[PDB]
Amino acid sequence: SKRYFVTGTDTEVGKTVASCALLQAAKAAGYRTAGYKPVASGSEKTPEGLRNSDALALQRNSSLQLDYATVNPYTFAEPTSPHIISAQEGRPIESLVMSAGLRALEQQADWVLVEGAGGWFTPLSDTFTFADWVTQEQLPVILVVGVKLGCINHAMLTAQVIQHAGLTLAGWVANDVTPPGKRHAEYMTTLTRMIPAPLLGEIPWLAENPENAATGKYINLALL
Amino acid sequence: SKRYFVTGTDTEVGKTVASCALLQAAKAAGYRTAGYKPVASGSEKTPEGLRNSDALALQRNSSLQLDYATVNPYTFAEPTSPHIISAQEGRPIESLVMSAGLRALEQQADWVLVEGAGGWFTPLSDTFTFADWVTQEQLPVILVVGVKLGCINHAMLTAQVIQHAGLTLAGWVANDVTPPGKRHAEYMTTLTRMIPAPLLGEIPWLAENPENAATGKYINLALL
Ligand SMILES: Nc1ncnc2c1ncn2[C@@H]1O[C@H](COP(=O)(O)OP(=O)(O)O)[C@@H](O)[C@H]1O
Ligand SMILES: Nc1ncnc2c1ncn2[C@@H]1O[C@H](COP(=O)(O)OP(=O)(O)O)[C@@H](O)[C@H]1O
Ligand SMILES: C[C@H](N)[C@@H](CCCCCC(=O)O)NC(=O)O
Ligand SMILES: C[C@H](N)[C@@H](CCCCCC(=O)O)NC(=O)O
Ligand SMILES: [Ca+2]
Ligand SMILES: [Ca+2]
Numbered sequence: 001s002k003r004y005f006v007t008g009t010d011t012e013v014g015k016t017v018a019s020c021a022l023l024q025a026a027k028a029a030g031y032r033t034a035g036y037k038p039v040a041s042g043s044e045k046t047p048e049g050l051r052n053s054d055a056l057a058l059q060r061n062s063s064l065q066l067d068y069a070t071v072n073p074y075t076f077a078e079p080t081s082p083h084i085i086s087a088q089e090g091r092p093i094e095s096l097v098m099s100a101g102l103r104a105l106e107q108q109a110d111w112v113l114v115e116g117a118g119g120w121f122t123p124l125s126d127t128f129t130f131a132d133w134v135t136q137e138q139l140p141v142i143l144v145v146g147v148k149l150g151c152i153n154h155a156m157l158t159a160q161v162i163q164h165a166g167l168t169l170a171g172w173v174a175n176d177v178t179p180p181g182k183r184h185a186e187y188m189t190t191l192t193r194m195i196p197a198p199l200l201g202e203i204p205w206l207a208e209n210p211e212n213a214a215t216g217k218y219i220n221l222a223l224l
Numbered sequence: 225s226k227r228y229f230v231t232g233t234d235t236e237v238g239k240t241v242a243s244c245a246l247l248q249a250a251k252a253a254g255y256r257t258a259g260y261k262p263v264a265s266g267s268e269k270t271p272e273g274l275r276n277s278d279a280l281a282l283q284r285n286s287s288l289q290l291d292y293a294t295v296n297p298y299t300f301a302e303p304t305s306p307h308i309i310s311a312q313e314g315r316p317i318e319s320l321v322m323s324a325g326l327r328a329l330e331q332q333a334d335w336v337l338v339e340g341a342g343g344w345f346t347p348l349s350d351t352f353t354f355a356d357w358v359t360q361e362q363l364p365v366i367l368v369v370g371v372k373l374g375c376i377n378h379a380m381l382t383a384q385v386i387q388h389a390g391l392t393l394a395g396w397v398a399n400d401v402t403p404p405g406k407r408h409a410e411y412m413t414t415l416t417r418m419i420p421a422p423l424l425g426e427i428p429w430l431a432e433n434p435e436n437a438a439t440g441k442y443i444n445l446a447l448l
Binding site for chain 2: 010011012079080081083084118119120121122123126149150152153154156157158160161164182183186187190193194
């Protein structure tokens with residue numbers, strides 16, 4: 001299977017919206033797709049247990065019919081850092097379980113997108129961060145950049161750190177979290193010059209419900 | 225002179241509020257102080273030229289009576305990245321001018337705090353970032369962390385990058401940009417464990433005008 005990890009310059013920059021666009025483009029290319037969010041925090045109660053909205057977005061944008069727990073094995077109700085609520089609840093986030101879940105999806109899918117939680121260094125325990133697991137698995141990384149004042153600094157910090165870990169930065173996606181602003185073109189040119197990987201596409205500001213929108217057309221999958 | 229550079233996990237995290245607290249503590253320790261913001265964007269028109277509010281905060285919190293241009297040689301009206309507006313206006317930001325200004329302050333002050341613009345990697349031209357100048361000058365670095373969801377990742381990214389440049393991270397300051405939230409203690413414990421430098425103090429949420437507030441008491445200067 002082709003496998004990619006998606007990270008962001010921060011929490012709430014559109015990692016989930018961009019992952020749905022990537023999944024839609026891959027399905028259009030003919031792949032059997034699966035989205036995987038191994039850890040999620042910020043979830044609602046239902047008859048079946050807790051359900052996270054970002055994991056549900058990945059489940060319904062995958063081409064295969066997948067069970068919720070296969071897409072998201074670790075679901076926490078409170079929207080905070082996973083290591084805090086894991087410790088509070090007495091439910092360890094185990095590296096072996098996260099890796100087993102990825103293998104289980106590779107039995108049915110040939111294109112798997114793994115979405116992180118928060119940015120690059122989100123702690124999963126007191127001695128283990130999400131970056132440690134990505135390094136262990138040697139996953140190529142796609143960076144989602146929310147375009148806003150302050151994003152050049154956060155895009156360059158994340159790019160340098162991935163490269164120093166010896167991982168491949170496969171590309172980046174620009175996501176327009178706000179309406180058209182005055183220096184949008186100049187920000188796009190600087191980010192293109194400075195991030196050492198191809199720009200895969202730009203998702204526009206979409207007021208109504210951008211997880212459900214047909215956004216695959218904004219990604220050029222040939223660059224991955 | 226003692227010289228320190230202050231950076232932040234992002235723009236608008238309280239770098240200026242924390243710099244005024246540091247300057248107030250240094251004056252209380254008996255130093256002849258000077259604040260220096262060599263580049264500033266986001267400024268008002270006056271009879272005397274453009275004036276930036278953060279540079280004015282540093283000027284009035286310094287113990288010496290200083291002229292505005294000595295505190296801030298490069299003033300731009302628009303609140304954007306300095307390299308965009310520098311190019312637009314035809315006014316180059318020169319490394320030699322920024323360094324000369326620092327030397328000029330060292331003639332009168334024995335404790336100088338240099339405040340950056342934005343975060344670590346803010347571009348000053350198409351081939352030069354603020355980090356390049358800090359490295360050239362070999363300044364020790366103080367990191368200001370705005371405590372909010374997403375700050376663990378941004379604090380760890382900035383810490384790693386400074387250390388890989390061979391610079392010293394002298395310490396960090398926690399700044400409470402919002403009211404007391406549910407996981408404040410746990411965030412403080414994680415940040416203390418993960419940032420490899422001493423916590424110099426914590427500035428509380430101060431609704432009214434925290435640049436003018438007496439905040440020196442929140443910094444323990446003995447750790448610097
Ligand atoms: N392109 C966009 N247009 C409009 N709103 C967006 C866009 N991208 C993200 N948003 C909104 O920003 C919020 C965070 O997006 P999300 O993908 O969940 O972020 P993340 O996975 O990085 O935490 C959501 O409410 C989402 O609808
Ligand atoms: N501790 C605080 N309490 C209340 N407001 C704060 C605090 N720190 C920062 N702010 C507010 O946040 C905004 C940004 O602060 P500022 O120091 O100018 O940031 P920066 O130098 O990082 O760009 C200002 O409006 C400021 O009043
Ligand atoms: C306007 C802001 N306050 C700040 C500049 C932020 C530049 C952000 C660059 C980036 O996108 O990383 N300017 C300043 O500190 O004077
Ligand atoms: C609640 C957020 N959306 C996110 C967790 C953010 C953790 C932030 C850690 C940090 O401070 O860097 N969870 C998630 O992606 O499922
Ligand atoms: Ca979300
Ligand atoms: Ca300010």
